[PDB]
Design a protein around this motif. Structure first.
Motif, PDB file in Angstrom:
ATOM      1  N   UNK A   1       0.824  -1.205   0.000  1.00 51.77           N
ATOM      2  CA  UNK A   1       0.000   0.000   0.000  1.00 51.77           C
ATOM      3  C   UNK A   1       0.862   1.261   0.000  1.00 51.77           C
ATOM      4  N   UNK A   2       1.945   1.260   0.779  1.00 52.61           N
ATOM      5  CA  UNK A   2       2.872   2.389   0.770  1.00 52.61           C
ATOM      6  C   UNK A   2       3.485   2.582  -0.610  1.00 52.61           C
ATOM      7  N   UNK A   3       3.880   1.485  -1.254  1.00 51.21           N
ATOM      8  CA  UNK A   3       4.420   1.575  -2.606  1.00 51.21           C
ATOM      9  C   UNK A   3       3.386   2.141  -3.578  1.00 51.21           C
ATOM     10  N   UNK A   4       2.129   1.708  -3.465  1.00 47.86           N
ATOM     11  CA  UNK A   4       1.119   2.224  -4.377  1.00 47.86           C
ATOM     12  C   UNK A   4       0.854   3.702  -4.125  1.00 47.86           C
ATOM     13  N   UNK A   5       0.974   4.146  -2.865  1.00 44.48           N
ATOM     14  CA  UNK A   5       0.843   5.564  -2.535  1.00 44.48           C
ATOM     15  C   UNK A   5       1.968   6.386  -3.153  1.00 44.48           C
ATOM     16  N   UNK A   6       3.175   5.823  -3.203  1.00 40.68           N
ATOM     17  CA  UNK A   6       4.330   6.527  -3.751  1.00 40.68           C
ATOM     18  C   UNK A   6       4.352   6.504  -5.280  1.00 40.68           C
ATOM     19  N   UNK A   7       3.821   5.447  -5.896  1.00 39.10           N
ATOM     20  CA  UNK A   7       3.865   5.260  -7.348  1.00 39.10           C
ATOM     21  C   UNK A   7       2.793   6.110  -8.034  1.00 39.10           C
ATOM     22  N   UNK A   8       3.148   7.351  -8.369  1.00 35.07           N
ATOM     23  CA  UNK A   8       2.152   8.322  -8.827  1.00 35.07           C
ATOM     24  C   UNK A   8       1.586   7.944 -10.195  1.00 35.07           C
ATOM     25  N   UNK A   9       2.443   7.584 -11.156  1.00 34.63           N
ATOM     26  CA  UNK A   9       1.921   7.324 -12.499  1.00 34.63           C
ATOM     27  C   UNK A   9       1.416   5.900 -12.688  1.00 34.63           C
ATOM     28  N   UNK A  10       1.506   5.058 -11.664  1.00 32.47           N
ATOM     29  CA  UNK A  10       0.825   3.784 -11.714  1.00 32.47           C
ATOM     30  C   UNK A  10       1.514   2.704 -12.506  1.00 32.47           C
ATOM     31  N   UNK A  11       2.761   2.914 -12.921  1.00 28.10           N
ATOM     32  CA  UNK A  11       3.455   1.857 -13.637  1.00 28.10           C
ATOM     33  C   UNK A  11       4.006   0.779 -12.709  1.00 28.10           C
ATOM     34  N   UNK A  12       3.760   0.872 -11.397  1.00 25.34           N
ATOM     35  CA  UNK A  12       4.254  -0.117 -10.461  1.00 25.34           C
ATOM     36  C   UNK A  12       5.718   0.009 -10.116  1.00 25.34           C
ATOM     37  N   UNK A  13       6.339   1.129 -10.463  1.00 27.25           N
ATOM     38  CA  UNK A  13       7.779   1.336 -10.350  1.00 27.25           C
ATOM     39  C   UNK A  13       8.006   2.749  -9.834  1.00 27.25           C
ATOM     40  N   UNK A  14       8.772   2.913  -8.763  1.00 29.35           N
ATOM     41  CA  UNK A  14       8.944   4.241  -8.178  1.00 29.35           C
ATOM     42  C   UNK A  14      10.212   4.875  -8.747  1.00 29.35           C
ATOM     43  N   UNK A  15      10.051   5.844  -9.653  1.00 27.24           N
ATOM     44  CA  UNK A  15      11.247   6.507 -10.145  1.00 27.24           C
ATOM     45  C   UNK A  15      11.690   7.579  -9.151  1.00 27.24           C
ATOM     46  N   UNK A  16      12.830   8.223  -9.467  1.00 28.69           N
ATOM     47  CA  UNK A  16      13.421   9.196  -8.547  1.00 28.69           C
ATOM     48  C   UNK A  16      12.480  10.358  -8.292  1.00 28.69           C
ATOM     49  N   UNK A  17      11.819  10.843  -9.342  1.00 26.69           N
ATOM     50  CA  UNK A  17      10.849  11.920  -9.209  1.00 26.69           C
ATOM     51  C   UNK A  17       9.766  11.568  -8.196  1.00 26.69           C
ATOM     52  N   UNK A  18       9.207  10.362  -8.309  1.00 26.67           N
ATOM     53  CA  UNK A  18       8.168   9.926  -7.379  1.00 26.67           C
ATOM     54  C   UNK A  18       8.730   9.761  -5.965  1.00 26.67           C
ATOM     55  N   UNK A  19       9.958   9.248  -5.856  1.00 24.86           N
ATOM     56  CA  UNK A  19      10.630   9.131  -4.563  1.00 24.86           C
ATOM     57  C   UNK A  19      10.772  10.490  -3.880  1.00 24.86           C
ATOM     58  N   UNK A  20      11.255  11.494  -4.616  1.00 24.49           N
ATOM     59  CA  UNK A  20      11.411  12.824  -4.030  1.00 24.49           C
ATOM     60  C   UNK A  20      10.061  13.393  -3.608  1.00 24.49           C
ATOM     61  N   UNK A  21       9.051  13.299  -4.474  1.00 25.42           N
ATOM     62  CA  UNK A  21       7.707  13.745  -4.106  1.00 25.42           C
ATOM     63  C   UNK A  21       7.258  13.148  -2.779  1.00 25.42           C
ATOM     64  N   UNK A  22       7.440  11.839  -2.614  1.00 26.91           N
ATOM     65  CA  UNK A  22       6.985  11.180  -1.393  1.00 26.91           C
ATOM     66  C   UNK A  22       7.797  11.626  -0.182  1.00 26.91           C
ATOM     67  N   UNK A  23       9.108  11.789  -0.350  1.00 30.19           N
ATOM     68  CA  UNK A  23       9.937  12.281   0.744  1.00 30.19           C
ATOM     69  C   UNK A  23       9.522  13.678   1.187  1.00 30.19           C
ATOM     70  N   UNK A  24       8.960  14.471   0.281  1.00 29.40           N
ATOM     71  CA  UNK A  24       8.535  15.824   0.613  1.00 29.40           C
ATOM     72  C   UNK A  24       7.148  15.877   1.238  1.00 29.40           C
ATOM     73  N   UNK A  25       6.413  14.769   1.242  1.00 33.69           N
ATOM     74  CA  UNK A  25       5.063  14.723   1.798  1.00 33.69           C
ATOM     75  C   UNK A  25       5.082  14.824   3.313  1.00 33.69           C
TER      76      UNK A  25
END
Ligand SMILES: [Ca+2]
Ligand SMILES: [Ca+2]
Ligand SMILES: [Ca+2]
Ligand SMILES: [Ca+2]
Ligand SMILES: [Ca+2]
Ligand SMILES: [Ca+2]
Lengths: 66, 66
Positions: free
Chosen positions: B42-66
């Motif tokens: 569930x945490x991974x799905x929350x972080x995976x913004x574009x839904x490809x099932x893969x957390x890229x660096x952009x998505x990682x930074x977004x989540x760290x800033x939340x």
């Protein structure tokens, strides 16, 4: 040839020429859902020969022929 | 950015530029295993913004800033 091309197009939902982890999950869910999400990740990694985080058509074919 | 890159590289163990759910489970096991397997997914799905099932660096930074 076109057999695999057609199947690849079915698995590639957004049409970007790559099968993502989530697209591979969908494939596995539609064939009995034998794996967990974590395990699909491992399947995707082993198939991703060139290590770009994506499964392209050439990588799909090598798997399909094995 | 130095620290964000450092953390991303630790989590992206197989070095494909993405963090999978499988990799996130390893990270969370190493930090004490505070979450069930399903909660990590569930945490991974929350972080995976574009839904490809893969957390890229952009998505990682977004989540760290939340
Ligand atoms: Ca398609
Ligand atoms: Ca795709
Ligand atoms: Ca690849
Ligand atoms: Ca990775
Ligand atoms: Ca949410
Ligand atoms: Ca993503």
């Amino acid at each position: 040839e076109e057999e695999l091309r057609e199947q690849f197009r079915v698995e590639d939902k957004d049409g970007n020429g790559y099968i993502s982890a989530a697209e591979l999950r969908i494939v596995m869910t539609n064939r009995g859902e034998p794996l967990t999400d974590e395990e699909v990740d491992e399947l995707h990694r082993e198939t991703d020969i060139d290590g770009d985080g994506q499964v392209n058509y050439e990588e799909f074919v090598q798997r399909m022929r094995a």
